[PDB]
């Protein structure tokens, strides 16, 4: 539908792919079709061994993602609501599990599923003028795209509760103050400052061992959700996977030869 | 009268205030207060109209100083553990209250007092309020859930330092370590935190009663298990809002550009 | 060997034991020998009945611990690397489980296993000019001393990922900002300002009931890795161990006679 | 009134407390009034210090507990059902947490809440002609008293799913075969064979250290629901509570003096 | 034709059968069979009429021998992990199917085949059927969920012994160790397990569909978290059956003393 | 010399036997025996050639009666806990040994003795051998990890009954409740369990040593967390066998129709 663009950058950004939501007519809302294409694009990247970092952003200035489509929802029977919402929770969850580092570039409004999708990314950067929040309670529903789990985990229980309870919408500076995002930018004339920073942060990842980066992610994500001792065992298991890699040795042969390693993900 | 339960009205309709009023014992958690607190909390657990609860003190300069140190000295060792466990228990029921809860700290909050506040979803305190867990200074440990809720609320390292040092912080410091989410200058009446709490609670009033409750359950429950199980819980909680009249009124209210009229169901 | 010195301070500071890494020629790297001595000291302190607080520091200005020695590593068989790194992970984990309060005085560089050792301590104090990070990914490996677990738990998942993915090194001032350390200050002329602070902090711990302090640490460490309900049960079981102590009585007595308590452990 | 009987036995049964359900007119179903009494009797029994073992049984021949009273349920508006069922669940869980060993004597029908009640007990004894099961699915609902959790834990997930999915009722012998009960025996002329076997089993628990017995239950119940390593720290904290008991020393003293021990709790 | 998905009728209406038809390679989990399997499994997740699913083999004497050994020798080290994980993931989706699942083992079930059976809620096998995880004999380990579901199904001790020894058991032994819940003597047609499966399936058909699904969720999810969280999960699952027409029918039927007639809703 | 650690050979190569030779105390867990046991276990953790470990007593009719009472009665309150923890810690180190472990029970196995056995992967015992946890009869509770390993091994209800009644079971009863995986009639030499253990041990030897090690890790670690994390752990362990020469050998062996010859790596 062209509503979702999957670009593979080059040159200086080689190794970076970008997922851009282009559906201004719907405020980039999650229509039953946009999640299909999203779910489709996500599975594709799951196995894409070339990718080293993934940026998720919008190509519609002023808007990141307004969440689920109110229009379609009001035309859904109760027995259909649950299934559709769970579909969104699952795609958002697959995104949280992408193999490489993920960065959400919020240059605009990010509500409900929009922020939940961003919460699924490893890192979030946003313009100070961007607005985000989970307003589900004002509609007598609750965040249904993982938000009740990821928000408390990212900023703490007390603040995640207050935001969800008051269904308050924060701006870039506020989100930054509560830790919702790790970098607050000054919006530029093209309305893509968050994206530029994300790209910049991404390049910063490109020079590392592809295999080490992926298992580092796995150790962090998996370990945080089990007791520390099991987490340590998981760290050992991920570390073991970097040992028989050419890259491990290429790393050593690069510093001994005083030269930038040329990792291949092997 | 050592425990006041007020159902506010008009603009504050839906807000219930639990006020500790034991000036004589510095609002210490005596056997009696603990009993009345438990009755109060259980009754509210089943109250259908409440949309937010505020826990505060009706004695200026004092939130709650903790367990009655006098009664403790009059308990045999075999009675200590059971008693302290009753404190840990009631404080845990407060943490599980169905609706949003706000602790208004306008005075001293020590031991069980601070733990009581920790059981609340949100904490608001005056700058001049003093709070801390000084159990280690008495050769014991926080026993009202503090060893669990303090590290969870501000991180392990800071929680450990505070407990190991038995340090007491003022409102400003509490805000700085994230022990509370709102801090402000005490006012002439000595109820600044309470006034602020009231304003914050009003912000919760307009939301769907059913969704607010299951939202609380998904957060409290989900945070204590792996994320995947958490998502399943979020799914089971969301599912309960679908067949509610409220959910429909929300979509209707949105379509008729007007304020939603929620009644729970 | 004087590579790992164990000082048992006394009078005014009695109860405080200082563990000093002194391997200037190797930047306090975790050589095979060091971990062996470290493990012996840790295990010794484990059962020491007079300790009340342990401070871990370097006696080498500008260097806390550079992490795993890159020399010895480049000389290991792929089947040896794993077990070596695991020994580091294990000892660092024994430090995490020391029975009493532990403080890390970071007056110098803390990289890889060095920062991981500091993470294993209960509290971290550092100089603003001190550097620290986990740059493993740059070498196509991941943190192996527990970093993938403790870093995310201490400063949050997103920031921990950003630091590990980019392999960024922070200074004390930045570490404070992200909550990596609890106390930051300006290095003094002696180059031991973190240490002075650590010492001052440890002294705040001395007056408290020794038994209560140990089970408080047990309740917290253990409770943070399980559900809150079980954590409450743990707190109860830990509290129970303070009820039949002489110190608990002394405490209620001191309070009565309005005087300073005199604790002896039991 | 006498719908719930609490008896404090003596002579050779001193220490055994019997809780008998006596509501024949309603098949001992869990009516609003019966759950209240049960909750009161349960709450009081926790703080009870002389109790050494509790037996839950029925004063009515051929019937243990039919579960919830379908009469009241039909008169309950949808908004009242969930809260009432969670109350049955909570009380049954309190039964699961009683301090001393618990034994369910099943001399009759045990359906739904009745069986869930028996599952909250540490040990289940039943007449071979006793019938028991969770038939909620035949009513388009699910076990609501902890059955979805306790049945799978007690006899395994596969067998638990089959019983709940088919809403099958088993007899005492098939219950023993699937491990639902520990002891099964031929019913006697009195119709209280299970109860008699429970008393004998109970008497086997009396001669043991009361404190050790209690913390042992805590250690078993709590450690089973968390990772094993945390479970080991829980065992540690529980063992500690027996160390400063006079009973521990009595045990050692009784062994030396080759004579039966005389414990008193403390 | 390698994967037949049937929607039975008559007395079996509501039962869906997924049959593996690849005698060519002992129903081995080839790249194609896996893609087809995943497509069908995903399709069944949204199938709103199915009330129970049975997984079986349409090839007498063989259930599924596991991953295709021929294809494996052609994969690079970098291709193995991904492929094995795909299998582990598809087997996990089967384990998460909304309705009751029954594995009918009338033949050989090795590695992925036995792991596939472990993903089903219930297993029935002919006494002459052989099954096991022999990965260790090939210097690898069960990679389809076996190291997790086997210990959970039969216990740690027995699972390690089977995996350490890479031993193959027959239906009778599988019954003895609790690996299967139902064992029967095989028949000429070679489909005795499938026949028993259908009969068991029919036992499930009359129950409330919504209650059946949330019961399965409560059991699967609660089992992998602490008991208390598990009770909260049960509460949330039970709540979803409260506002259903089926639940009122259940009560109406009991009062009219007739068999209830459920429709999901 | 109270603990012999021998590395067998000729058909038994790869098997190491751990023998408790301390009859003057019923093989009780003395400070000294614990020190030695801990040293052996820690040494075995790096022994690159071992493929299976057997723990048994070289004293007829006795496995291990647990901690030594004589020493205990000489320890002050402050020393018991630390010592008991030391027992729990070493027994836990045994549960974590890298290779399959079999406990050969040919005699009395009480307290720490049975607990040590519970730490092994598999338990074999003579029908006449006796074992149990009688701590509660001494006013204490199992302190070697029994409160945790027993319930997990035979179920909560049974472990509670055994611990509460401080009952002693014989090999036959141990088999019936699942406490042990194999029971034999004792032989004239009084080492029937040992011979069984050796035979069972020899069945492990041919398998890929790397795969065996990571198989145990997947099983032990996966069983203590949620299934999903467990599947992730299995993936990480599976991944380690991919770049091994043993895996390739396994496939080549099959192809050339000949028994595989693994050397680890």
Curated annotation (Swiss-Prot), chains A, C, D:
Pathway: Amino-acid degradation; L-leucine degradation; (S)-3-hydroxy-3-methylglutaryl-CoA from 3-isovaleryl-CoA: step 3/3. Keywords: Acetylation, Branched-chain amino acid catabolism, Disease variant, Lyase, Mitochondrion, RNA-binding, Transit peptide. One of its GO terms (biological process) is fatty acid beta-oxidation. The keyword RNA-binding applies. It catalyses: (3S)-3-hydroxy-3-methylglutaryl-CoA = 3-methyl-(2E)-glutaconyl-CoA + H2O; (3S)-citramalyl-CoA = itaconyl-CoA + H2O; 3-hydroxyisovaleryl-CoA = 3-methylbut-2-enoyl-CoA + H2O; (S)-3-hydroxyglutaryl-CoA = (2E)-glutaconyl-CoA + H2O. Residues 32-46 are annotated as: RNA-binding. Transmembrane segments: none annotated. The modification N6-succinyllysine is found at residues 27, 36, 40, 71, 75, 87, 131, 138, 256. It comes from the Eukaryota. Changing residue 40 to Q: Abolishes RNA-binding. The keyword Oxidoreductase does not apply. Belongs to the enoyl-CoA hydratase/isomerase family. Homohexamer. This is Methylglutaconyl-CoA hydratase, mitochondrial. It comes from Homo sapiens (Human). The lineage of its organism: Eukaryota, Metazoa, Chordata, Craniata, Vertebrata.
